[PDB]
C-alpha cells in the first residue's frame, strides 16, 4: 500500500492535519495506512477512522441521491429521452461508493474486529460494519440485496447485544449504535414501528441514567439523545 513506508505515528498525525484541512479522502487514506500497520487502535484513533470514512462516503451518498433522483425523473411519463449518460454517471458514483464501503468492511474483517476484545472497541467496530452494509443496502437492487440487508442487521444485532450487557444506557457509543440501528429499521428494513420503539426505549433508559453522570458526560449523552428525539418527532 502507498502508506507502507510511513510511520504509524506520522500517519495518525497527518490524519489529524487532513481533518483540520477538511481533506477527508486524504484523512481516510492515512487512517487506512495506520490500520494496516496491524496494531489495535486507541479510542481516539477509532474515531479518526470513523470520521474520515463517514465524510468520504457521506459525500458519495449525497451525490448518488442527486443523480438517482434525476434518473428517476427521466423515467417518468412524458420525460424526453436523453440517452445513457445519467444512468452511466450514477453507476460510476455508485461503483466508487461501493468500493469505499468494501474497503472499510475489509479493514474491519482484516483484522480489526477479531482482535477487538473490549466492549468499547468491539461495539464500535460492529456498529461500523452495520453502517457500511447499510450504505451498500441503500444502492442495492439485485440478487444479493436481501443478504446485504441481513449482514447489516446481524452486525448491528451483535453490537446491540454486547452494548446492553457491557455498557450503561447513556454510553455515547451505545446511544449512537441504537440511533443508527433505528434508522436501519426505518429506512432499510421497512420496519418503522421497530425504529420508533427502539428510539423511544433507548431515549427513556438513557434519561433515567443521566443522574449518574458528570456535567461533561451529561453533555455527551444528551447530544445524542436529542438526535433520537429529532427522529421520533419526524417519524410520529
Amino acid at each position: 500500500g502507498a502508506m507502507g513506508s510511513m510511520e504509524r505515528a506520522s500517519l495518525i498525525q497527518k490524519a489529524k492535519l487532513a481533518e483540520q484541512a477538511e481533506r477527508y479522502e486524504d484523512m481516510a487514506a492515512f487512517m487506512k495506512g495506520a490500520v494496516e500497520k496491524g496494531e489495535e487502535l486507541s479510542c481516539e484513533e477509532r474515531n479518526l477512522l470513523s470520521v474520515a470514512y463517514k465524510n468520504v462516503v457521506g459525500g458519495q451518498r449525497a451525490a448518488w441521491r442527486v443523480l438517482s433522483s434525476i434518473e428517476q425523473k427521466s423515467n417518468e411519463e412524458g420525460s424526453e429521452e436523453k440517452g445513457p449518460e445519467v444512468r452511466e454517471y450514477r453507476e460510476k458514483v455508485e461503483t466508487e461508493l461501493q468500493g469505499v464501503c468494501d474497503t472499510v468492511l475489509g479493514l474491519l474483517d482484516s483484522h480489526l474486529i477479531k482482535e477487538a476484545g473490549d466492549a468499547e472497541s468491539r461495539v464500535f467496530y460492529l456498529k461500523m460494519k452495520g453502517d457500511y452494509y447499510r450504505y451498500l443496502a441503500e444502492v442495492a437492487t439485485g440478487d444479493d440485496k436481501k443478504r446485504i440487508i441481513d449482514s447489516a442487521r446481524s452486525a448491528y444485532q451483535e453490537a446491540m447485544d454486547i452494548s446492553k450487557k457491557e455498557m450503561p444506557p447513556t454510553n455515547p457509543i451505545r446511544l449512537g449504535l441504537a440511533l443508527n440501528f433505528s434508522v436501519f429499521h426505518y429506512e432499510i428494513a421497512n420496519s418503522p414501528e421497530e425504529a420508533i420503539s427502539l428510539a423511544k426505549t433507548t431515549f427513556d433508559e438513557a434519561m433515567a441514567d443521566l443522574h449518574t453522570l458528570s456535567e461533561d458526560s451529561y453533555k455527551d449523552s444528551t447530544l445524542i439523545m436529542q438526535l433520537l428525539r429529532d427522529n421520533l418527532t419526524l417519524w410520529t
Partner: peptide, 9 residues
Amino acid sequence: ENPTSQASQ
C-alpha cells in the same frame, strides 16, 4: 463531505 440531512448519527 458528510451532509447534515440524514437521520443517522
